[PDB]
A and B are shown apart, each in its own frame.
Chain A
Amino acid sequence: ARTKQTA
């Protein structure tokens, strides 16, 4: 799956 993790 595609994710965005906190940057």
Chain B
Amino acid sequence: GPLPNALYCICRQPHNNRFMICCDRCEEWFHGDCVGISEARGRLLERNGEDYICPNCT
């Protein structure tokens, strides 16, 4: 699994136990609060199996 000091997202910062979502087009991980996805939306997207497309990829 990845090390705790790996970098992600548009912000180039670690996971830090923050809510994150993976882009199905570029495979990068994004902090929800960086890209506009609430935890609640994340819960729904995870359960409904729908793709997430990040801002870079839009």
Chain A residues at the B interface, C-beta cutoff of 8 Å: 1-7
Number of interface residues of B (CB under 8 A): 18
In the docked arrangement, what's the CA distance between A3 and B19, Å? Answer: 7
Is B17 a contact of A3 with CB atoms below 8 Å?
no
In the docked arrangement, what's the CA distance between A6 and B49, Å? Answer: 20
Name A's interface SS.
loop
**Residues of chain B lying within 8 A (CB to CB) of residue A2:** 21-22, 46, 52
Chain B residues at the A interface, C-beta cutoff of 8 Å: 15, 17-22, 24, 29, 39, 42-43, 45-46, 49-52
16 CB-based A-B contacts, threshold 8 Å: A1-B45, A1-B49, A1-B50, A1-B52, A2-B21, A2-B52, A3-B42, A3-B45, A4-B19, A4-B20, A4-B21, A5-B39, A5-B43, A6-B18, A6-B19, A7-B17
